[PDB]
Homo-oligomer: A and B are copies of this chain.
Amino acid sequence: SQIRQNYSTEVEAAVNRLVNLYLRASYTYLSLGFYFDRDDVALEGVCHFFCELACEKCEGACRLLKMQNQRGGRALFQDLQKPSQDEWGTTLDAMKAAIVLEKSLNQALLDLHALGSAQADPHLCDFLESHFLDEEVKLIKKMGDHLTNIQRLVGSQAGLGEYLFERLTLK
């Protein structure tokens, strides 16, 4: 590489693995989105929430791939595993699966940051802090707020609660 400088093979490979994780997350959210569009599920605000997250995760993948080429690394794509479920249950089940997925992405970001720290790669550490770590903390906080509101609404009238959350929060 004519440009590569202070860019370890370890970080280059970890960045490719992180792109895979972000594209798998995007695929998971595409499945969640279309599940909530089923005529027998029919929660449009939940459809929109997850389709928006499919787009945001594809953006994170593309940002990583841009940075890989800016550093002189080589993008390598792997197969994208299908999402973990075909049917996603209630909005509560879906939001629980989403926060588990985002905690796994956050841990992957923190692991890559630690690798960049170990490799003395301050551009990598800046890139993640600037475009990923705060976005991920913000999203996980929003999902926790949603989980608490969804849980508050179950009580003994779960259908009513699920409708109201979709109508009055995800509108």
A164 to B5, CA, bound (A): 30
A159 and B167 contact, CB distance less than 8 A: no
**Residue of B with least CB distance to A143:** B3
Known: A3-B140, A5-B107. 8 other contacts (CB 8 A): A31-B77, A39-B144, A69-B141, A79-B80, A80-B82, A151-B159, A153-B163, A160-B161
Chain A interface, DSSP helix/strand/loop, else mixed: helix
B31 and A141 contact, CB distance less than 8 A: no
A38 and B160 contact, CB distance less than 8 A: no
A152 to B43, CA, bound (A): 11
B160 and A71 contact, CB distance less than 8 A: no
- What are the residues of chain B within 8 A of A9 when measuring CB–CB? none
- What are the residues of chain B within 8 A of A80 when measuring CB–CB? 27, 79-80, 82
Closest Cβ–Cβ distance, residue A8 to chain B (whole Å): 13
Query: A interface vs B, CB < 8 Å?
Result: 1-3, 5-6, 23, 27, 30-31, 34-35, 37-42, 44, 62, 65-66, 68-72, 74-83, 86, 99, 103, 106-107, 110, 113-114, 117, 120, 122-123, 125-130, 133-134, 137-138, 140-141, 143-149, 151-165, 167-169
A132 to B44, CA, bound (A): 25
A164 to B168, CA, bound (A): 9
* Pairs A–B under 8 Å by Cβ, sample size 17: A2-B144, A3-B99, A5-B110, A23-B27, A31-B77, A42-B148, A79-B79, A110-B122, A113-B122, A122-B125, A126-B129, A126-B133, A153-B160, A155-B160, A156-B157, A160-B161, A164-B164
